[PDB]
Write an enzyme that holds these catalytic residues in place. Sequence first.
Site, PDB file in Angstrom:
ATOM      1  N   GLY A   1       1.225   5.654  11.024  1.00  0.00           N
ATOM      2  CA  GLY A   1       2.648   5.991  11.216  1.00  0.00           C
ATOM      3  C   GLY A   1       3.519   4.766  11.486  1.00  0.00           C
ATOM      4  O   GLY A   1       4.739   4.896  11.331  1.00  0.00           O
TER       5      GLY A   1
ATOM      6  N   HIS B   1       0.809  -1.249   0.000  1.00  0.00           N
ATOM      7  CA  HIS B   1       0.000   0.000   0.000  1.00  0.00           C
ATOM      8  C   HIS B   1       0.836   1.290   0.000  1.00  0.00           C
ATOM      9  O   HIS B   1       0.246   2.383  -0.155  1.00  0.00           O
ATOM     10  CB  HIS B   1      -1.016  -0.030   1.123  1.00  0.00           C
TER      11      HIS B   1
ATOM     12  N   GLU C   1       0.775  -8.388   0.704  1.00  0.00           N
ATOM     13  CA  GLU C   1       0.974  -6.992   1.203  1.00  0.00           C
ATOM     14  C   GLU C   1       2.456  -6.691   1.406  1.00  0.00           C
ATOM     15  O   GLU C   1       2.770  -5.642   2.002  1.00  0.00           O
ATOM     16  CB  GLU C   1       0.168  -6.808   2.499  1.00  0.00           C
TER      17      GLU C   1
ATOM     18  N   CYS D   1       3.223   1.703   9.887  1.00  0.00           N
ATOM     19  CA  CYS D   1       3.278   0.762   8.734  1.00  0.00           C
ATOM     20  C   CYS D   1       4.719   0.686   8.239  1.00  0.00           C
ATOM     21  O   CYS D   1       5.431   1.721   8.137  1.00  0.00           O
ATOM     22  CB  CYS D   1       2.253   1.060   7.633  1.00  0.00           C
TER      23      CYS D   1
END
Length: 182
Positions: free
Chosen positions: A146, A41, A72, A148
């Site tokens: 914040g 992402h 991911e 990730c």
Amino acid sequence: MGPGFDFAQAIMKKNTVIARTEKGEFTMLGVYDRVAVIPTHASVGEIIYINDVETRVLDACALRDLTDTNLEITIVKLDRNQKFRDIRHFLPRCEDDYNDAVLSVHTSKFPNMYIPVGQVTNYGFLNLGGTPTHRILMYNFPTRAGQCGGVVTTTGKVIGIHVGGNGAQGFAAMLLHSYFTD
Ligand SMILES: COC(=O)[C@@]1(C)CCCN1S(C)(=O)=O
């Protein structure tokens, strides 16, 4: 404060950079040579900022499992003039559960942040922001925007990168040794 924080600190000090994309600032784990990982992402493009240096992306691959399900994890090769310490021997070979994990973050917003998250469950399937995702680890800490890309470790193992939360639990994508064979 103890050997969990000691291993986490050793990984942060040598094997992390601050990555900036158009989607924000992320903790980015360097694994070996010029190869690093970041949540998919983050939407890595042709150019990324690495510790505020404009850097060409030589290759980027959004990983999926053999069911063609999102993991991911994006693997990025950076046009950087310096190699990372090779930490592939700290990566687990198989999916597993863990005790006594630390989530470690380094950004402009959260410098030198270490969170003892405790027991880590092999959760498996998660609908992550609407996207079916596999190989998810879960821990019972209220993680925040914040965090990730934050690195999840135990003593002796680098087991995942933080990719989301629901306000009460946090979720990481597994790192497996097989992702980084060359
Ligand atoms: C030889 O295979 C590769 O190049 C792999 C898939 C192995 C790990 C790094 N990459 S990467 C830069 O993401 O392409």
